[PDB]
Amino acid sequence: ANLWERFCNWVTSTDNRLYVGWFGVIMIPTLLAATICFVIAFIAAPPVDIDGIREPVSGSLLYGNNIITGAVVPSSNAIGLHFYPIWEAASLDEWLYNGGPYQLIIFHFLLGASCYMGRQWELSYRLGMRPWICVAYSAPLASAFAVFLIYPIGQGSFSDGMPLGISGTFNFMIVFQAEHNILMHPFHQLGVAGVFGGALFCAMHGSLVTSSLIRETTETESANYGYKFGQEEETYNIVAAHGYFGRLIFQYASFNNSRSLHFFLAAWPVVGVWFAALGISTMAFNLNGFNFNHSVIDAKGNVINTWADIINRANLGMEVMHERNAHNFPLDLA
Amino acid sequence: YSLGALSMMGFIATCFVWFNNTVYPSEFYGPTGPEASQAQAMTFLIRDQKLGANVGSAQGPTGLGKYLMRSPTGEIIFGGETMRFWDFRGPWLEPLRGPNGLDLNKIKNDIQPWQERRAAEYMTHAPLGSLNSVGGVATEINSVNFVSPRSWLATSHFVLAFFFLVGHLWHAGRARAAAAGFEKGIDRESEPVLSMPSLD
Amino acid sequence: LIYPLGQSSWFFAPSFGVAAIFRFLLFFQGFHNWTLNPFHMMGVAGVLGGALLCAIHGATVENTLFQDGEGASTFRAFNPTQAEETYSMVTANRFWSQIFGIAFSNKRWLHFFMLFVPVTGLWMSAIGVVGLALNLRSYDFISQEIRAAEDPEFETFYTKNLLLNEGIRAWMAPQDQPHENFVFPEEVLPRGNAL
Amino acid sequence: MEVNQLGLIATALFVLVPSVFLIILYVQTESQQK
């Protein structure tokens, strides 16, 4: 074998402790740059002029943040969708002021995670598996794309990207409700059905399989030792599990097919979360939640409030207070 | 492969209908988001100048110009949040454009009634609306039956492009598994991993 | 139950309705800053983590199946009473080990963990809401308020969120709490520029 | 910043004590006969 052949053999090697692969060849450096830039910024980055109004926001620990409040602040509204790599800045000091770390981190991140997904396909192919784990992974990835790239694109600025921080996350959320009434959007509701339901079926599945483990141990030892890695025989009794759950609700509401069951387990949170993502991604272009403001009117024409209008009042509080110095004109059009 | 390509094309179309006003003329499709934000700025710049404001020297609350400021490369642009959209270009705004960006003397002297009209129309037909098509911001009251065509077309094609990317992944991975002969699962008597050395 | 019991009345409990529940969410933000509460955060971790496990487990099983039929549709190639595992634990473990670095190797542990995560999450969240009944919130970081109070150039996403909360309270309270007879004059309503 | 001055000891003991409990248990586990 020549050098290139040997290299290819190493890269796609199924014996490497962590799989590299060709997707990994792109993924690794990008995720490293992103991680390192993130970590360093989170600790030490100076305040960032997020809203382009020369009103810098401190995101880093050393500049007075804790873990919950800390963030990497989105790049300046003055930049918008302009590409702002370090070399477009006159200095690192300027780069930092306008929030370059945000763009560097999220772009490397998105590239890296796309490659992570590709990498899941690649390795699944290398091990002789079916290939769709990566399809399962596409839901959170799509969400990340929705909040870091697609929303900024639609609104015309990365300053509107989700900040890389917990409290900044909440900020992004409150402002999103204010501008799109996301709660009243069926795609977000589908998202919610997705994660709540995901949790429900996870707990459910956990509980039924755990409930039907075949006795292989004594009471003075963990039941986990009742299963040995790689054994051919199944470790629980699915017929008993189905017997239980099928009587809990009714027979035909229960799975006797493990494959069908696990497919459902895959599909529900994943499809739902695809919808959450599409929710963010379409409100990105301001097709917003249901608007039932003043939907209810009496015979004379008096407005009769519904819960939608109270939501509306909350939304208003949010609208008027967010980014208190950025607006000069009465409408927030993006 | 075709699913992948159509997915790519879908995303391209989404951005096309969102930003471009040439092959998607705003006369037919409505204003772009950028067009409309800029249109708000134009409208009130006009209003206040009519009222006697010096819009060039008008300092906003932040220190930035209330109506006019510089882009990061120095171009004169509408100020406030609409700063993000300074890359917007439209037939109604460009006559106010000079070599260095918005020309203060043209603004002071050359704004025509058709521009005020156009700016007002676009400002008030910004591409914002509810799923049931209540026009305007999410907190706006029922009154206006409106969602911009730009939003319908951009959103529809994002959803579609995305699911087609999903389909791409599904079918490319399956074509791989089927070509290699394990799309139906692992051979019990020939489990590849079982012939591999342990990782540790 | 506990929450309204800690408040003035059942009035402030969630109402049984879609939008009403949403209002309940937004109230908790504005009034309790409930997102900032680490019990809710653990709730989040348990729910999203449970959904993650659900998806990842289903997919892993579905992509490590043994070929047990000739059908290209693989569901029929299973029999409930069969003794053998329907998917390869060994291949799944290697896959995730090489992809992610760690992997389940024990199915019983995997599934107990699948029980544990969402159940524990919800439980933590329940504890936090029990705190909210008494208005015993994580509303503020004191160090933050002292700094921001003395230093008007100091801004974090935390202070920004408090502005949002303050808006929520003033704009929603009169209609949300009609028994209070709130009258908030235009001039007292907190607003930023223009909006 | 005007932090709670006990936050340091609180956090430190919160990490260390159970960490230590667990390390004790692991180590006495490994040394049992194979």
Binding site: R17, L18, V39, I43, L61, L62, N66, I67, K228, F229, G230, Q231 | S198, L199, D200 | V90, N93, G101, I102, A103, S105 | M1, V3, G7, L8, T11, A12, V15
Partner: peptide, 30 residues
């Protein structure tokens, strides 16, 4: 000091990742 603590805890976690991955107890087929 807060910052020291936070960064410290984080570092402990990354180290933990490292041990948990490369120095895990190996899975064995019986």
């Amino acid at each position: 000091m807060e910052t020291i603590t936070y960064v410290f805890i984080f570092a402990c976690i990354i180290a933990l990742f490292f041990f948990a991955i490369f120095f895990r107890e190996p899975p064995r087929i019986t």
